[PDB]
mmCIF file of C-alpha atoms in Angstrom:
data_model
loop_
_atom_site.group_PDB
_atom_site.id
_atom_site.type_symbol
_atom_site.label_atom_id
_atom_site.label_comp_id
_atom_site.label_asym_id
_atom_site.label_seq_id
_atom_site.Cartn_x
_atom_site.Cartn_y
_atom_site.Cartn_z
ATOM 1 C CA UNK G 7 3.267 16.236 10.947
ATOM 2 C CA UNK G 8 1.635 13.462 8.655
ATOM 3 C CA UNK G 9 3.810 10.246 8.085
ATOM 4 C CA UNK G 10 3.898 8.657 5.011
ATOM 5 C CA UNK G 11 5.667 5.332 4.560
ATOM 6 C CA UNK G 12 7.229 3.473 1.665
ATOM 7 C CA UNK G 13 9.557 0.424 1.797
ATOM 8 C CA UNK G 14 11.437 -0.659 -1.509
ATOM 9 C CA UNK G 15 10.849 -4.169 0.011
ATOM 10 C CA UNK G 16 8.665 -6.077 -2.605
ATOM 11 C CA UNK G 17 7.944 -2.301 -3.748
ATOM 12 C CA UNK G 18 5.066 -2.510 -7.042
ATOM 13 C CA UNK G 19 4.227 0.132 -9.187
ATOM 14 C CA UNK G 20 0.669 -0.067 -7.677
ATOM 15 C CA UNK G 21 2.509 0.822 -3.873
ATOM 16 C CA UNK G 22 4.756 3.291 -5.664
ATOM 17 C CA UNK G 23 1.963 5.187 -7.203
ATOM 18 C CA UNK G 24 -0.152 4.559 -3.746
ATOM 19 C CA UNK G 25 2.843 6.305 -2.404
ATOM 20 C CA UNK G 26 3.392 9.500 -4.739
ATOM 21 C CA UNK G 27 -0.446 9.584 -5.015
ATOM 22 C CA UNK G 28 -0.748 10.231 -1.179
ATOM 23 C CA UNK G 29 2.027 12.760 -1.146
ATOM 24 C CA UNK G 30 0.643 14.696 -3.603
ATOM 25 C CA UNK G 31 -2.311 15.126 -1.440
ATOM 26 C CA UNK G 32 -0.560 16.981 0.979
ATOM 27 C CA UNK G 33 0.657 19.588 -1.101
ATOM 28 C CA UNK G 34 -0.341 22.812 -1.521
ATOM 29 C CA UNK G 35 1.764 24.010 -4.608
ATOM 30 C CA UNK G 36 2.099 27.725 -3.816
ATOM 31 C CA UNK G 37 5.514 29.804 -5.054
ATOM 32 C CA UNK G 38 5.840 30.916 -1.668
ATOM 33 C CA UNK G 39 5.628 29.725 1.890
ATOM 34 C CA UNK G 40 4.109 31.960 4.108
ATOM 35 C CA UNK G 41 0.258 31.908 4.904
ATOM 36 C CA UNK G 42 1.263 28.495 6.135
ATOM 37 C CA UNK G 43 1.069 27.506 9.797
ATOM 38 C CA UNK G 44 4.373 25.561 10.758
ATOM 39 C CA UNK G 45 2.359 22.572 12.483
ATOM 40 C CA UNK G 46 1.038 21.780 8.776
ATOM 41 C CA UNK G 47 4.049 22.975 7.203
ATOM 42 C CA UNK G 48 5.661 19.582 6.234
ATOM 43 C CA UNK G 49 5.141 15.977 4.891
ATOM 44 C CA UNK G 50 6.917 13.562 6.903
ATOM 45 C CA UNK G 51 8.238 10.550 4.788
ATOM 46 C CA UNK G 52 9.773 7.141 6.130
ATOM 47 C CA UNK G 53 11.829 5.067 3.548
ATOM 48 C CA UNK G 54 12.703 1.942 4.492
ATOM 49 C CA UNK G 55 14.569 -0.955 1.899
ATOM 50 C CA UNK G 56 15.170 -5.106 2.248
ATOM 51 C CA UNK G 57 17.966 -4.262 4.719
ATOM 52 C CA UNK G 58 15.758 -2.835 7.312
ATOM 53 C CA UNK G 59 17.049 0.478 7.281
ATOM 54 C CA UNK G 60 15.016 3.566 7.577
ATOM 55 C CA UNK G 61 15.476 7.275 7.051
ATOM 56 C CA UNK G 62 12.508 10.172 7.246
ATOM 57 C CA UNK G 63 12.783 12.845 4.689
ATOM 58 C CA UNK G 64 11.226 16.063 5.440
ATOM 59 C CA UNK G 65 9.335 17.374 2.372
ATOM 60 C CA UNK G 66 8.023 21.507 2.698
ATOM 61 C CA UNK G 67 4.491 21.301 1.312
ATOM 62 C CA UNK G 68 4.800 24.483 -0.619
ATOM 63 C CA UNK G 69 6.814 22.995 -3.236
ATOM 64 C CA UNK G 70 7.011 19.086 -2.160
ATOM 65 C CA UNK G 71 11.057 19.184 -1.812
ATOM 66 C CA UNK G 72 13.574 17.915 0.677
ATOM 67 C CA UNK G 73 14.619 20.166 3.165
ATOM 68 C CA UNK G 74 16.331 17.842 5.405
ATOM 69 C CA UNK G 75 15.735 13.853 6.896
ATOM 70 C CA UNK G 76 16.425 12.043 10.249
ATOM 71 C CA UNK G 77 18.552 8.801 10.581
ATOM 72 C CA UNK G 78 18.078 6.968 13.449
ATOM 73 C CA UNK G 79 19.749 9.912 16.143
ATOM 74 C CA UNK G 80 20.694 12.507 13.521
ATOM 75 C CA UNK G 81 19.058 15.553 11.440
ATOM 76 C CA UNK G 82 20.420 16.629 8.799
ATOM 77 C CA UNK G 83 19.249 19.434 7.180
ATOM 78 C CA UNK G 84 19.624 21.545 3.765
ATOM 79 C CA UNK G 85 20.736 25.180 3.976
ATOM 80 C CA UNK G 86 17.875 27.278 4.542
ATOM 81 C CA UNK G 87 17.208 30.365 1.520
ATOM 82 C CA UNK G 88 16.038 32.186 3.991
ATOM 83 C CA UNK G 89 14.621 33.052 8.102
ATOM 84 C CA UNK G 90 11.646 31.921 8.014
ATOM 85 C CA UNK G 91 12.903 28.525 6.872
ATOM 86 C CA UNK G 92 16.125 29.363 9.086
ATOM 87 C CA UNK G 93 13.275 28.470 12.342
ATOM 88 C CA UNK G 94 10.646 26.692 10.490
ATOM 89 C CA UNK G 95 13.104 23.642 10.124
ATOM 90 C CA UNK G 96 13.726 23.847 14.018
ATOM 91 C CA UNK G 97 10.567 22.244 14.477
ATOM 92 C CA UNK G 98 11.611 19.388 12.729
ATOM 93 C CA UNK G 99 12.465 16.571 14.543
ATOM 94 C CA UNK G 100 12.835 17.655 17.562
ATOM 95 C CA UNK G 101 13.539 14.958 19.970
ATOM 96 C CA UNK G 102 16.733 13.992 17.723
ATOM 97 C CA UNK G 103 19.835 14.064 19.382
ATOM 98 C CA UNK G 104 22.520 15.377 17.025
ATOM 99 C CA UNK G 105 21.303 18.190 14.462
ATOM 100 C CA UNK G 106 23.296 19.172 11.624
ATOM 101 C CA UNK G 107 22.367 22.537 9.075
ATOM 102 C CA UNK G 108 24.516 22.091 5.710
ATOM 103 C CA UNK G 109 26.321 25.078 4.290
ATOM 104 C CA UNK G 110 24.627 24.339 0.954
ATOM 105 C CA UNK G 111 21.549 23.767 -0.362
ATOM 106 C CA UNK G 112 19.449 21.389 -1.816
ATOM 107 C CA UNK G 113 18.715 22.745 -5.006
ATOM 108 C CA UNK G 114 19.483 20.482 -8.197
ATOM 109 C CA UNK G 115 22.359 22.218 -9.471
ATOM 110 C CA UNK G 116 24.194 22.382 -5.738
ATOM 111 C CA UNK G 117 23.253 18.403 -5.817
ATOM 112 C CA UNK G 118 24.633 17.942 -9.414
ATOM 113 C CA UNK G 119 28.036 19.834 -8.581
ATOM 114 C CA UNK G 120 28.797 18.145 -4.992
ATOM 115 C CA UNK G 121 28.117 14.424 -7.000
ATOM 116 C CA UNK G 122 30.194 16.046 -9.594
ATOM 117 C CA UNK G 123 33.212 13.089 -10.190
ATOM 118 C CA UNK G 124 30.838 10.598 -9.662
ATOM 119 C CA UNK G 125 27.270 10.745 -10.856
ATOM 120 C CA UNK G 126 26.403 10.953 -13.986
ATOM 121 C CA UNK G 127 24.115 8.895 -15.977
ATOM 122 C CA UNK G 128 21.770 8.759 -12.056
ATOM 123 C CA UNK G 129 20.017 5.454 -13.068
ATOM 124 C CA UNK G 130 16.426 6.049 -10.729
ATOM 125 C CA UNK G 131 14.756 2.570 -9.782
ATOM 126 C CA UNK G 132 13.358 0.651 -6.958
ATOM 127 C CA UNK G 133 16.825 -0.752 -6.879
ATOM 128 C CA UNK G 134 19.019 2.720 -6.451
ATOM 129 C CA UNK G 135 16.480 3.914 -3.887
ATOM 130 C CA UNK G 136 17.129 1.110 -1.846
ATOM 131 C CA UNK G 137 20.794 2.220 -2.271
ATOM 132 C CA UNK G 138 20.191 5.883 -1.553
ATOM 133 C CA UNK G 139 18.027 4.822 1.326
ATOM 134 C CA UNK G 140 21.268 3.308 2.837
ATOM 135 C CA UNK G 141 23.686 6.270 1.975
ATOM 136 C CA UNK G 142 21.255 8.182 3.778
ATOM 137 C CA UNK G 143 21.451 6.643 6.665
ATOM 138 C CA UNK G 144 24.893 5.625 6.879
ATOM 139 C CA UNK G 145 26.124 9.379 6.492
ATOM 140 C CA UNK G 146 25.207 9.631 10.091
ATOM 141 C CA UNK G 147 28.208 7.306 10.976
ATOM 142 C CA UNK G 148 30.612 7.786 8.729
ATOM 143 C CA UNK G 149 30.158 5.300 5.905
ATOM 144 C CA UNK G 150 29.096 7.518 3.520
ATOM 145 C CA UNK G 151 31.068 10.076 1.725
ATOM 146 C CA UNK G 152 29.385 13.799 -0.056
ATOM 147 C CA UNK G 153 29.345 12.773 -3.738
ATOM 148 C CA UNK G 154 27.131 9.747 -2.747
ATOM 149 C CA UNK G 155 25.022 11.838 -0.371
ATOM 150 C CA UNK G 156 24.278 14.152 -3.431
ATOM 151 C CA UNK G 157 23.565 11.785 -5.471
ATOM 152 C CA UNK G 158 21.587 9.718 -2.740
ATOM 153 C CA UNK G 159 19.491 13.262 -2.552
ATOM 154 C CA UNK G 160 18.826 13.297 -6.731
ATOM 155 C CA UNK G 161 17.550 10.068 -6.521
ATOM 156 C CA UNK G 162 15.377 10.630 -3.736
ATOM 157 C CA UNK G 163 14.162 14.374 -4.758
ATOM 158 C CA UNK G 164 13.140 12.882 -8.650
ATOM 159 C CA UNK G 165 11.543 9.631 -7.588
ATOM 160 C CA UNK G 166 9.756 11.270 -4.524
ATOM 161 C CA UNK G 167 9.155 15.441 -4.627
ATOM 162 C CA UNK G 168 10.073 15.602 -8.335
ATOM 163 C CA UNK G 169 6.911 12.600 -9.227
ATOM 164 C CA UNK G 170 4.950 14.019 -6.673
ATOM 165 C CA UNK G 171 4.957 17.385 -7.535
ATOM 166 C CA UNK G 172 4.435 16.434 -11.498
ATOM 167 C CA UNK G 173 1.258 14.937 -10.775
ATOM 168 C CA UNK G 174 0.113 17.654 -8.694
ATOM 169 C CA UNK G 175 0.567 19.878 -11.875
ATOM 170 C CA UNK G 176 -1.009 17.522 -14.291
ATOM 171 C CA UNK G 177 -3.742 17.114 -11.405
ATOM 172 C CA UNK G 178 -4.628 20.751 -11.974
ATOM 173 C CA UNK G 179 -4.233 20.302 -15.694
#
């Protein structure tokens, strides 16, 4: 799958909008997956901050959304709506050692509920992606408990699928 990187590390709104822009050119907004070979099926993005640290997020290019990332030796992934997802997302990173399928989804409102005593007010920024970037990656050892993961996944879904997908629809008027 195509790799797209970002770092937040001297991150301008000139590389940010680089960033979304090229994202957006993988998409293929369509309501449904299906007519979709599985070898084009996703938009690999690397997100690295000032400490170094460096997840992939897995975006579907139906709908440019997060359906699960890799951290170093892990995979984590989103539960699946459906079969055809169930095995599509088998094919994603596949040389990681440890794979891990949540029980729940991805979806804004699971995200909101599972950050639920901590996040509100979910300030977005170069600065909290760095952040999220971290919680991301530290989940994979430990260091990073489920509200923060959920929130860590908001902040990554609006400043990455969310902007992406926005433009795509404003693209097409």
């Amino acid at each position: 799958y195509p790799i797209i990187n970002f770092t937040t590390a001297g991150a301008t709104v000139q590389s940010y909008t680089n960033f979304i822009r090229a994202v957006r050119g993988r998409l293929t907004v369509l309501p449904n997956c299906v007519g979709l070979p599985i070898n084009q099926r996703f938009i690999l993005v690397e997100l690295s901050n000032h400490a170094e640290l460096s997840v992939t997020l897995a975006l579907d290019v139906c709908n440019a959304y997060v359906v699960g990332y890799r951290a170093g030796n892990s995979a984590y992934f989103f539960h699946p709506d459906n079969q055809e997802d169930a095995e599509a997302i088998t094919h994603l990173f596949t040389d990681v050692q440890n794979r891990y399928t949540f029980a729940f989804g991805g979806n804004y409102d699971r995200l909101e509920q599972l950050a639920g005593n901590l996040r509100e007010n979910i300030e977005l920024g170069n600065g909290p992606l760095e952040e999220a970037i971290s919680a991301l990656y530290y989940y994979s050892t430990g260091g990073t408990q489920l509200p923060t993961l959920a929130r860590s996944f908001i902040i990554c879904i609006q400043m990455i699928s969310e902007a992406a997908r926005f433009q795509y629809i404003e693209g097409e008027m």
